[PDB]
Amino acid sequence: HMMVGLIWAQATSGVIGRGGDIPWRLPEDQAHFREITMGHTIVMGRRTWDSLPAKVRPLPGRRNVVLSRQADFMASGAEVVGSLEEALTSPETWVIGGGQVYALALPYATRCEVTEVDIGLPREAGDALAPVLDETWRGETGEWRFSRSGLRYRLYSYHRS
Ligand SMILES: CCc1nc(N)nc(N)c1OCCCOc1ccccc1CCC(=O)O
C-alpha cells in the first residue's frame, strides 16, 4: 500500500508557495509542515529543490526524493528519480512542490494538507496555483487563527479513498 499525500501553503487567491519562494511570513506553517512530514518520504521537483535555502537542503529528518527528467542532474543528500512511480516506494509519501509535481501526483493522492494564508496576493504571470480539488475530497475546514506574524491562517485536512 503506497499512500500519497500532498501538502502546500497558499494565499486566498490560490497562489502557492514553492520551495523557498514564499512571500508570507507564517512561522507556524513550518511547524505544521514538519509535523506532517517528519518520519516520512518527501518528493519534490528540481526547481523546488533548487529554490530551497542551502541550510534546509536537504530537509532534515526525512528521506528526500527529487523528481527530474534531466538525466545529468544530481543533488547531495537526496535520491534522484526520473518517474513519480519510482518515488512512491515508501508506505507514506508527501509531495511538497511544486506545481508541476502536484499535478503529476494528484491522481495518486488520498490526502491533502493545506495551509491557507489570509493575504492579498493576485495571480501574476509565472505564479503557480493550488491543485483544484473536486467533490471526491472529504474535508474538515479549520477556524481562522492569528499567527504570531499578525496574519490570519487556517488549516485544511482533505482526504479520499
Ligand atoms: C514550510 C513551507 C511549506 N509549508 C507547507 N504547508 N507546505 C509546503 N510544501 C511547504 O514547503 C516545503 C518546502 C519549502 O520548505 C522550506 C522553505 C524555506 C524555509 C524552510 C522550509 C522548510 C524547512 C523544514 O521543513 O525543515
Curated annotation (Swiss-Prot):
It comes from the Bacteria. Pathway: Cofactor biosynthesis; tetrahydrofolate biosynthesis; 5,6,7,8-tetrahydrofolate from 7,8-dihydrofolate: step 1/1. Its EC number is 1.5.1.3. Gene3D superfamilies: Dihydrofolate Reductase, subunit A. It comes from Mycobacterium tuberculosis (strain ATCC 25618 / H37Rv). It catalyses: (6S)-5,6,7,8-tetrahydrofolate + NADP(+) = 7,8-dihydrofolate + NADPH + H(+). One of its GO terms (biological process) is one-carbon metabolic process. Pfam families: DHFR_1. This is Dihydrofolate reductase. Key enzyme in folate metabolism. Catalyzes an essential reaction for de novo glycine and purine synthesis, and for DNA precursor synthesis. The lineage of its organism: Bacteria, Bacillati, Actinomycetota, Actinomycetes, Mycobacteriales. The gene is folA. Residues 3-160 form the DHFR domain. The keyword Magnesium does not apply. Substrate binds at I7, W8, A9, D29, R34, R62, Y102, T115. PROSITE patterns: DHFR_1, DHFR_2. GO terms for cellular component: cytosol. Belongs to the dihydrofolate reductase family. It is an enzyme of class 1 (oxidoreductase). The keyword NADP applies. InterPro entries: DHFR, DHFR-like_dom_sf, DHFR_CS, DHFR_dom. One of its GO terms (molecular function) is NADP binding. Inhibited by isoniazid metabolites. The prodrug isoniazid is metabolized to isoniazid-NADP adducts that inhibit the enzyme at subnanomolar concentration. NADP(+) binds at residues 8-9, 16-21, 45-48, 67-70, 82, 96-101. Keywords: NADP, One-carbon metabolism, Oxidoreductase.
